Amino acid sequence: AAPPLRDRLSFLHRLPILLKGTSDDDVPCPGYLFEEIAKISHESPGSSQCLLEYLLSRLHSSSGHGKLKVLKILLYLCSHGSSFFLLILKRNSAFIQEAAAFAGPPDPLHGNSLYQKVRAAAQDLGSTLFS
Amino acid sequence: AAPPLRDRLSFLHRLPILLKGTSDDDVPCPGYLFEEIAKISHESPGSSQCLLEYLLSRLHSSSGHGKLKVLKILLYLCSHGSSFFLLILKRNSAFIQEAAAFAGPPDPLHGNSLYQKVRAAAQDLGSTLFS
Amino acid sequence: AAPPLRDRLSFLHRLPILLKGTSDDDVPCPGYLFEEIAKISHESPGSSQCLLEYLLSRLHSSSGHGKLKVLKILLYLCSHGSSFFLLILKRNSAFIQEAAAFAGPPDPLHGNSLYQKVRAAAQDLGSTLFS
Amino acid sequence: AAPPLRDRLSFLHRLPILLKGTSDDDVPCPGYLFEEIAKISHESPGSSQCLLEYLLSRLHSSSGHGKLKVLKILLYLCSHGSSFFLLILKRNSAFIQEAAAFAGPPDPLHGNSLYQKVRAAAQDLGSTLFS
């Protein structure tokens, strides 16, 4: 049930898209990359499996900037991703309450705004995915 | 046997409670949050599963300050949490000897007091949970 | 199906080879160590299992310098390693898209060149292994 | 087959011994603690399971100082620990080649001596355990 190698290779060729869309920085992700990422989820079930692995990996390893981007991407996929992608997202959704607990020391310039944005995005994702 | 999504969503709505109760800082957790957390454990078995995931995640990722809070919360749940919560806590109790081994460099102001507090709380939890 | 202990011990005796070949530094790996590592993969199936464990561990724990070396070694093994090694590499190939996502802050002297080299090596490995 | 809770509790009461024996510092472990740790392994199979969990956790989380202590303790247990402990150690022995790969930046005062000591202890453990 794991992705066939042909799907792993197709997905590798898509990584320029995803690298820009989830870059761990304060530059908002542009709209066209949301559209491209939803298109990736529809390529095949194996493409969707690879995409979930990738997005959850980025969510774990990124600072709040990249975490926020992943959570926004997942929220968009709730409305435009494939049915199979949303199924495996629901089956692997224990991460949402962890994203909703993201916290740390406040920034002298921005306070806790970034943490609050990440937690709010996780709450919105949970409300959408779980209702 | 994993939590249904309706329980994951209910639990998300409780996270303000838990975020304050386990905040990774030197401010003691107030009594009313112990009571609220025990109430969460009684909501449903799925709520208890989510709660265990959350508390063990906080125990792993926090400094000694948050570790101590989680261990005190778990000790309180030994006397006031649901039967199902204490069952799954007992089934997942290998972490206690790890908490009881918490150590690190001494603080110039407070010495090893924080490590000693964490280890003592883990020992008390083990004595309560395992007897 | 895990390696017998005799194979674990033989592999330990090979670690001087692998330690030099994957050292986490900017000194390129010399050609003779590629040859020696391919020879290790042919010693036995258990030797190949140990070798995969080792290379994937180094890939995870190293800076970009050691990551690049591991990815070059794996690419060489695609052309000269044992059939069993390439089978278990294919079965454990989810790491490739993670290596192909390697990124971080740019270097004032070298920019993003190291990240780009790692990602390019991961793409080449995927193209070779998955086609 | 996991340890009963009575064994988890007995083991908690032994942690003062193990905390001193594996302390992550440059003070050699005294001989009497080797003897006490071997005695712990003989208390019961569950005590041995807890002991393995503890020692492997310390091996993973410690600097080279604590890693070296754990590897010396395990070598001693090869000659004086219980039969059950050595069985489960052999079943969980993939860590040895990872310890035998321990490396890092050299120390201006001590060079690579610590890494070399850890790797040599891992090689000795493997030679003893695997032969």
Swiss-Prot record, chains A, B, C, D:
Disulfide bonds: none
Transmembrane segments: none
Localization terms from the record: Golgi apparatus, trans-Golgi network membrane; Cytoplasmic vesicle; Cytoplasm, Cytosol
Start and end residues of each ENTH domain: 6-131
Complexes and interactors: Interacts with AP4B1 and AP4E1; the interaction is direct and mediates the association of TEPSIN with the adapter-like complex 4 (AP-4), a heterotetramer composed of AP4B1, AP4E1, AP4M1 and AP4S1.
Function: Associates with the adapter-like complex 4 (AP-4) and may therefore play a role in vesicular trafficking of proteins at the trans-Golgi network.
Protein name: AP-4 complex accessory subunit Tepsin
Organism of origin: Homo sapiens
Top-level taxonomy: Eukaryota, Metazoa, Chordata, Craniata, Vertebrata
Part of the whole protein covered: 3 to 133 of 525
